[PDB]
Amino acid sequence: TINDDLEAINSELTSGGNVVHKTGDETIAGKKTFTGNVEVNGSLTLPTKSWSGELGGGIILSLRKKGTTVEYSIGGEISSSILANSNLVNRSVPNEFCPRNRCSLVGHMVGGWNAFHIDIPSSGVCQWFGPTASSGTPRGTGTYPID
Amino acid sequence: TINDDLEAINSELTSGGNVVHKTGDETIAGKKTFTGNVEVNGSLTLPTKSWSGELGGGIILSLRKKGTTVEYSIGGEISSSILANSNLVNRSVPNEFCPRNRCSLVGHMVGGWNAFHIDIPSSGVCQWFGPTASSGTPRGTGTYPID
Amino acid sequence: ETINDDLEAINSELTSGGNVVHKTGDETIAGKKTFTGNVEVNGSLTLPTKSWSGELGGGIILSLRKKGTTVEYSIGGEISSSILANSNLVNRSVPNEFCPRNRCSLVGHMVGGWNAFHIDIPSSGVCQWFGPTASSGTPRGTGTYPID
């Protein structure tokens, strides 16, 4: 009957089926391109992964990728002589956190005016571009892009 | 009439009702999980809040949270002796802007080669990790995560 | 009849196409969409992107990529002539599209020692050097600033 057809269609308009609704928890497949403005009042969750390791010389790099941006924080303490303009060779940054282009991450040494930077190239073999140093507490928080 | 039933259904499928459409400004409740890729051509807007305050010693920290990322801008002008490795005790960063993990925000002093950093711990009691300084113009723009 | 003509159209749009967003399919969606709840994206989330690179002045190169209203920067090049403290960098301005509403200070570091500087991008895009007067060295630094 026409009533039976309408009833089933009405159901789809309310919830379920293959239509996205203005209410309800829903899972949505397909590439969705929004051409206007999108606002999210709740949380926005993207794929995330974290890693932390000692790059070299006592310097620790802690990373968290959210989509295609990596959050970094530099930690640790210089506990052996790190030579000027040298490769940090204890651990490389894993491939999933390596950028397409070399990024230069600026940091600061606790208690004075001294700054350094560490490069992360696409290989993940990071490089120290301060001078030769054998002590101190390096710090710095920021982001770099993966893409 | 059956035709009126059918036409009212069609109306819902083209605007309004509980259906999300490919045109029109719409408000959408429920947890929506996109299992594929999403592209936004307009703006993407997340919950946003701003705060600025004098942490201590003439240093002003200006913050704007967008979702779970905080944009920071270090400003002001040193107006008293800010001691090396010191708590900034004029104003704490409000809880809403305090990170889960202590972040180190690298800055630079106008007119020379001098860098510092300011830590924002989970408590919001910020700390200056330059050396003792009683003058200068501190600056630096970046981000840190809340989560 | 008219009934089946109507039901054809309705059934069609309930499955794909039409002006309905579906739980499958590659679709383009116009209008401001406000999600009052939580949103998760399991794939990629892509925003409008544009890139620009130019020599600001004195050999210093700024490479920029805007993703939405955030600009990714990387400082490059090499100081190859005298740049005075507090001076405008007048070889190239940052294009309007990448200029911030609020002045940003981009901290950098000079290769091989402990020296830091910063470069401001004012709303005008006429960048300013806030290191000391300098005529040599390799400036670097990667970060972000907001346009809005």
SS3 B111: coil
Task: Flag if C105 and B141 touch (Cβ within 8 Å).
Answer: yes
Task: Say if B8 is an interface residue toward chain C (CB within 8 Å).
Answer: no
- Residue keyed to tokens 């790099």: A61
Reduced DSSP (H G I as helix, E B as strand, rest coil) percent helix, strand, coil of chain C, to 5: 10, 45, 45
Give me the count of residues in chain B: 147
Contact, A143 vs C143, CB < 8 A?
yes
CB-count burial class (<10 Å; 0-12, 13-18, 19+) for A32: buried
Contact, A129 vs A121, CB < 8 A?
no
Indicate the residue of C18, C33, C106 with minimum beta-carbon distance to B26: C33
- Of residues B134, B115, B123, B121, the one with CA closest to residue B59: B134
Q: Please give the order of strands across the beta sheet that includes C139-146.
A: C49-57, C60-67, C70-77, C139-146, C104-110, C116-121, C128-129
Task: Say if B79 is an interface residue toward chain C (CB within 8 Å).
Answer: no
Task: Say if A40 is an interface residue toward chain B (CB within 8 Å).
Answer: yes
Tell me the longest C-alpha to C-alpha distance in chain C.
Answer: 85
- What gap in Å lies between CA B29 and CA B43, rounded to an integer? 19
Residue C147 has, within 13 A of its CA and on its CB side, a CA count of 19
The residue type at B104: S
Cα–Cα distance list, B18 to A20, A21, C131 (Å): 9, 5, 58
Which chain A positions have a beta carbon within 8 Å of C53's beta carbon? Answer: none
Å between C48 CA and nearest CA of chain A: 10
- CA C53, B144, A101, A146: dihedral to nearest 10 degrees? -120
Task: Say if A10 is an interface residue toward chain C (CB within 8 Å).
Answer: no
- If one counts every other C-beta atom within 10 angstroms of the C-beta of residue A98, the result is 18
Q: Which of C39, C47, C106 to mutate to test the interface with A (most CBs of A within 10 A)?
A: C39
Chain centre distance of CA C110: 24
Task: Say if C107 is an interface residue toward chain B (CB within 8 Å).
Answer: yes
- Of residues A145, A63, A136, A137, the one with CA closest to residue A104: A145
SS3 A53: strand
- CA C34, B95, B138, A118: dihedral to nearest 10 degrees? -80
Strand runs (DSSP E) across chain B, as ranges? 26-28, 32-34, 38-40, 44-45, 48-56, 59-66, 69-76, 86-87, 103-109, 115-120, 127-128, 138-145
Contact, B72 vs C78, CB < 8 A?
no
Å between A60 CA and nearest CA of chain B: 14
Task: Say if A38 is an interface residue toward chain B (CB within 8 Å).
Answer: yes
Q: Which residue of C has its CA nearest to A116?
A: C114
Indicate the residue of A26, A44, A129 with minimum beta-carbon distance to C23: A26
Task: Flag if A34 and B47 touch (Cβ within 8 Å).
Answer: no
- Residue keyed to tokens 């599209």: C97
Spell B112-121 as b/e; 16+ CB within 10 A means b. bbbbbbbbbe
Task: Flag if A139 and B129 touch (Cβ within 8 Å).
Answer: yes
Which chain B positions have a beta carbon within 8 Å of A38's beta carbon? Answer: 40, 42-45
Positive or negative torsion for Cα C69, C74, C80, C86: positive
Residue C14 has what DSSP assignment?
H
What was the resolution (in A) of this experimentally determined structure? Answer: 1.6
Task: Say if A18 is an interface residue toward chain B (CB within 8 Å).
Answer: no
Task: Walk me through the domains of chain B, giving residue ranges and CATH numbers.
Answer: 1-43 (6.10.140.2190), 44-147 (2.60.40.1830)
Task: Say if A32 is an interface residue toward chain B (CB within 8 Å).
Answer: yes
Contact, A79 vs A115, CB < 8 A?
no
Q: Which of A98, A117, A122, A139 to mutate to test the interface with C (most CBs of C within 10 A)?
A: A117
Task: Flag if C29 and A33 touch (Cβ within 8 Å).
Answer: yes
Task: Say if C112 is an interface residue toward chain A (CB within 8 Å).
Answer: yes
Contact, C139 vs C115, CB < 8 A?
no
Which chains reach chain C with 3 or more Cβ–Cβ distances below 8 angstroms? A, B
Which chain A positions have a beta carbon within 8 Å of C14's beta carbon? Answer: 9, 12, 17-19
Pairing of β C128-129 and β C116-121: antiparallel
Contact, C6 vs A5, CB < 8 A?
no
Pairing of β B127-128 and β B48-56: unpaired
Pairing of β B32-34 and β C39-41: parallel
Task: Say if C75 is an interface residue toward chain A (CB within 8 Å).
Answer: yes
The residue type at C111: V
Q: What technique determined this structure?
A: X-ray
Indicate the residue of C2, C21, C42 with minimum beta-carbon distance to B22: C21
Which chain B positions have a beta carbon within 8 Å of C120's beta carbon? Answer: 139
- Of residues B115, B103, B113, B104, the one with CA closest to residue B139: B115
